């Protein structure tokens, strides 16, 4: 989101996999920040979701 | 080749700069895309100095047809890389960026390869001056009273 | 070789003699040759 | 070209400076547009030294028309890039910025390309001196007894 | 060779860059595949200046085939390393990275090796000028009255 | 031109330095305006060394008419930029400031262009020495007994 209300394009990243214990949920290229930014990070699951340590490379 | 339009060239330049691509989550606005298209047109007009500059086959869109973006540029397959690298270099200023060393080197190399063939064609030798004799070795020219080179 | 060869002439950047182009055409109305010194972006013209 | 007015030139210069563009979510200010138009007029008057400078086809506005903005610049399509790059470089100190190396180099290259054709045109040879003989090989000069070159 | 497709070239380039390989835990993303494939096509078309540049045997995909990815590149085994090292160097700025010194040196070495054989082939001596005598030592030409070389 | 007075030049110089303009929320006092006008008059008088220096057509104010500010400077259109750039450079130290590199370069370029035409006109060649014969080829001079060139 660039204004705090509306969220833009939605991209699907495999955040889990059966019987795999090292996945590295990652997105290569995020866009250029104009003024502000926020992230949604929505998940739809039937299995537990554990998430920690979100980070970016702002440069 | 997929880079078929001026919009495609601008998108390639943005992808090179890292500002916008197909994998991004935030994109630049169409007004910014139009401004970049106008900068591409200005750069090509500056290069092609009304026929005495760098010839590439670029087509300058007319204002009668409303959108300049979306018209095929008409460049050959070997000039697209140079053109969009130079475009990225030119439009990096706008976003408070600076084109990286690889981008600048590729831009220089592409411009050089763009002008190589035109330089080879233009490397012409002037004719003999108006004050050279043709020489008596040219018997055929001697028999026709062609004793001096015309010139010009 | 004698005819179709460029003669001995100086190499000039256009900015060096911009505005003094009539001093180098070959006339003898001037006691010296003037050159441009400064540029609005580079401050000073490179010396070579 | 979509750049047809002094306002378009000023907007392009401000975009390149990053002062006011869509990519930065900043709109152009009229108090910053009048100053930039005044600078553009001063720069063009300084360049075109009353006919003995860099000929560009720029159309100088008059005091009769109250708003200087809105008038076509009259520039050829191969001059706009150089002109607005130079304008951005000149008006950066107003906002106490510093035009980046890419903009400075583009302004230099564009100014040189602007003067190239006029330099080629002005590179002319003086006529023969008034004291040189015409030689005995020129049939028309021999007929008219023009033993010496006119000079001047 | 194991590297037989444009996709294999892109995977090798990304692995060398470290963006996505099994050395790390990253997997190649389709949008990172397509952009690099387009970049590779543009770079190869720039190199192969319609036959007057670097010859590699690279097969240029036509628009009729929807996926450019998956088609065989057609390069010889001795060109794959150079091609994918230079591709990694060219697509490094996409992710705002910088190719390492070893990658840059290998790219330079591979490009030189690519052009070596073509340079040897093209280093050809011009024929004899049109104004040479054939010499009286050549009895055949002397009797035939081929006293001078053809030229061109 | 929009700039038509010494105060207009001073305000342009302040705009360049970034001290005050038509959009700033703070301004400088009329005494400071008068001081800047005085510095401009001093610098113009220093340039115009009683006619033996730089000729620009500047009209010096008189004390009978009270306000020096408000008089047309009389400069041509091609001198305004140079004059106010050098004025900004000169009055920068007053406000504990320093003119930037672009302003200094433009000042140098403007002064050079200001003196270019005067230098061209002043580049004159002295007449022949009084001990130089006119030559026997100078028929009219020899007939009128002007055997030697007139001394001066």
Touch test A–F: 3 Cβ pairs or more under 8 Å: no
Q: Name the DSSP class of F33.
A: H
Contact E56, E71 (CB under 8 A): no
* SS3 call for E148: strand
Residue of D112, D123, D129 with shortest CB distance to C21: D123
List the alpha helices (DSSP H) in D18-151: 30-47, 80-91, 101-122, 139-143
Distances (CA, A) of D88 to D23, D96, D107, F17: 17, 12, 9, 16
The two structure tokens encoding residue D103: 């903009």
CB contact under 8 A, A24 and E25: yes
Distance CA D131, CA D35 (A): 57
Q: Which residues of C lie closer than 8 Å to B, measured between beta carbons?
A: 3-4
Q: What are phi and psi of F43, to 5 degrees?
A: -70, -40
Name E5's bridge partners.
E72
Distance CA E28, CA E22 (A): 10
CB contact under 8 A, E93 and B103: yes
* SS3 call for F143: helix
Residue of F101, F112, F124 with shortest CB distance to C38: F112
Touch test E–B: 3 Cβ pairs or more under 8 Å: yes
Q: Which of D93, D94, D108 to mutate to test the interface with F (most CBs of F within 10 A)?
A: D93
Q: How far is A24 from chain E (nearest CA, A)?
A: 6
Q: Please name the helix (run of DSSP H) or strand (run of DSSP E) that holds residue E112, with its range, or none.
A: helix E101-122
- Closest Cα in chain B to A29: B24
Distance CA D27, CA F102 (A): 25
- Closest Cα in chain C to B149: C3
- Closest Cα in chain B to D82: B46
Distance CA B148, CA F80 (A): 58
Distance CA D145, CA D130 (A): 15
Contact E88, E108 (CB under 8 A): no
DSSP string, A3-55: SSS------------TT-S------S-----SS----------SS--------
Strand C38-39 to C43-44 pairing: antiparallel
Distance CA C43, CA D110 (A): 16
Number of other residues whose CB lies within 10 A of the CB of residue E120 = 9
Touch test E–F: 3 Cβ pairs or more under 8 Å: no
Q: Please name the helix (run of DSSP H) or strand (run of DSSP E) that holds residue C44, with its range, or none.
A: strand C43-44
Longest CA span, chain E: 81
The two structure tokens encoding residue D85: 């790059």
CB contact under 8 A, B38 and D3: yes
The two structure tokens encoding residue F92: 């920068």
Size of interface A-E (CB pairs under 8 A): 16
Distance CA A56, CA E95 (A): 13
The two structure tokens encoding residue B103: 């981008």
Instruction: Please report the residues numbered 1 through 59 in chain A whose beta carbons come closer than 8 angstroms to any beta carbon of chain B.
Output: 2, 8-9, 11, 27-34, 37
Q: What are phi and psi of C39, to 5 degrees?
A: -130, 150
Distance CA D3, CA B96 (A): 22
Q: How far is B91 from chain D (nearest CA, A)?
A: 8
Q: Please name the helix (run of DSSP H) or strand (run of DSSP E) that holds residue B39, with its range, or none.
A: helix B30-47
CB contact under 8 A, D117 and B90: no
CB contact under 8 A, E93 and B113: no
Contact E9, E84 (CB under 8 A): yes
The two structure tokens encoding residue C28: 């003898």
The two structure tokens encoding residue B41: 């047109």
Distances (CA, A) of A21 to A28, B43, E19, E25, E42: 21, 52, 21, 11, 40
Q: Please name the helix (run of DSSP H) or strand (run of DSSP E) that holds residue C43, with its range, or none.
A: strand C43-44
Distance CA E31, CA E12 (A): 16
Touch test D–E: 3 Cβ pairs or more under 8 Å: no
Contact B29, E65 (CB under 8 A): no
The two structure tokens encoding residue D124: 């002319």
Q: How far is D50 from chain C (nearest CA, A)?
A: 12
Q: What are phi and psi of E69, to 5 degrees?
A: -60, 135
Distance CA E119, CA E48 (A): 14
Chain B residues touching residue A30 (CB < 8 angstroms): 24-26
The two structure tokens encoding residue E35: 């952009």
Number of other residues whose CB lies within 10 A of the CB of residue D105 = 14
Return all residues near B44 (Cβ < 8 A) that are at least 6 apart: B56, B58, B60, B83
Q: What are chain B's partners, defined as 3 or more CB pairs within 8 angstroms?
A: A, C, D, E
B128–chain C Cβ distance below 8 A for any pair: yes
Query: Euclidean distance between the first and final Cα of chain F, in Å?
Result: 45
Name F148's bridge partners.
F133
Q: Name the DSSP class of F66.
A: S
The two structure tokens encoding residue E128: 């004899």
Chain E residues touching residue A22 (CB < 8 angstroms): 25
Torsion, Cα E10 E12 E18 E19, to 10 degrees, reads 20
Q: At what angle do helices B80-91 and E30-47 cross, to 10 degrees?
A: 120
CB contact under 8 A, B117 and E52: yes
What is the length of chain F? 152
Distance CA E139, CA D45 (A): 77
Q: What are phi and psi of A5, to 5 degrees?
A: -115, -60
Distance CA E106, CA E84 (A): 10
B133–chain C Cβ distance below 8 A for any pair: no
Return all residues near D28 (Cβ < 8 A) that are at least 6 apart: D10, D11, D14, D20
- Closest Cα in chain C to B131: C3
Distance CA D45, CA F81 (A): 8
Q: Name the DSSP class of D24.
A: G
CB contact under 8 A, F120 and C31: no
Touch test B–A: 3 Cβ pairs or more under 8 Å: yes
The two structure tokens encoding residue F54: 């730089």
Technique used by the depositors: cryo-EM
Q: What are chain F's partners, defined as 3 or more CB pairs within 8 angstroms?
A: C, D
Contact B142, B134 (CB under 8 A): yes
Contact E59, E103 (CB under 8 A): no
Size of interface A-B (CB pairs under 8 A): 36
Closest CA to E128 of E151, E94, E98, E148: E151
Residue whose pair of structure tokens reads 């002295």 in the numeric block: F126
Chain B residues touching residue A26 (CB < 8 angstroms): none
CB contact under 8 A, D80 and B48: no
Q: How far is C39 from chain F (nearest CA, A)?
A: 6
């Amino acid at each position: 989101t660039t204004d705090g209300i509306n969220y833009g394009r939605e991209q699907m990243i495999e955040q889990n996999e059966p019987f795999v214990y090292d996945k590295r949920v990652l997105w290569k290229r995020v866009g250029r920040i104009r003024r502000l930014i926020g992230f949604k990070l929505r998940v739809i699951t039937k299995s537990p979701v554990t998430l920690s340590g979100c980070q970016i490379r702002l440069e | 080749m997929q880079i078929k339009t001026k919009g495609d060239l601008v998108r390639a330049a943005l992808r090179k700069l890292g500002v916008a691509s197909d994998a991004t989550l935030t994109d630049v606005e169409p007004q910014s895309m139009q401004d970049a298209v106008d900068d591409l047109e200005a750069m090509m007009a500056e290069w092609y100095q009304d026929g005495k500059g760098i010839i590439t086959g670029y087509v300058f869109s007319d204002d009668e047809n409303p959108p300049a973006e979306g018209d095929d540029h008409g460049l050959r397959s070997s000039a697209v890389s140079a053109v969009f690298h130079n475009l990225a270099c030119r439009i990096a200023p706008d976003y408070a960026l600076e084109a990286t060393a690889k981008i600048i080197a590729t831009a220089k190399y592409g411009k050089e390869l763009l002008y190589k063939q035109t330089a080879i064609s233009r490397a012409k030798r002037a004719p003999y001056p108006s004050r050279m004799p043709t020489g008596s070795g040219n018997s055929f020219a001697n028999l026709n009273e062609w004793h001096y080179f015309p010139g010009e | 070789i004698v005819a179709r060869t460029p003669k001995k002439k100086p190499f000039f950047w256009p900015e060096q003699i911009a505005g003094f182009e009539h001093m180098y055409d070959g006339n003898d109305d001037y006691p010296y040759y003037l050159l441009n010194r400064t540029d609005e972006n580079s401050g000073d013209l490179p010396t070579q």
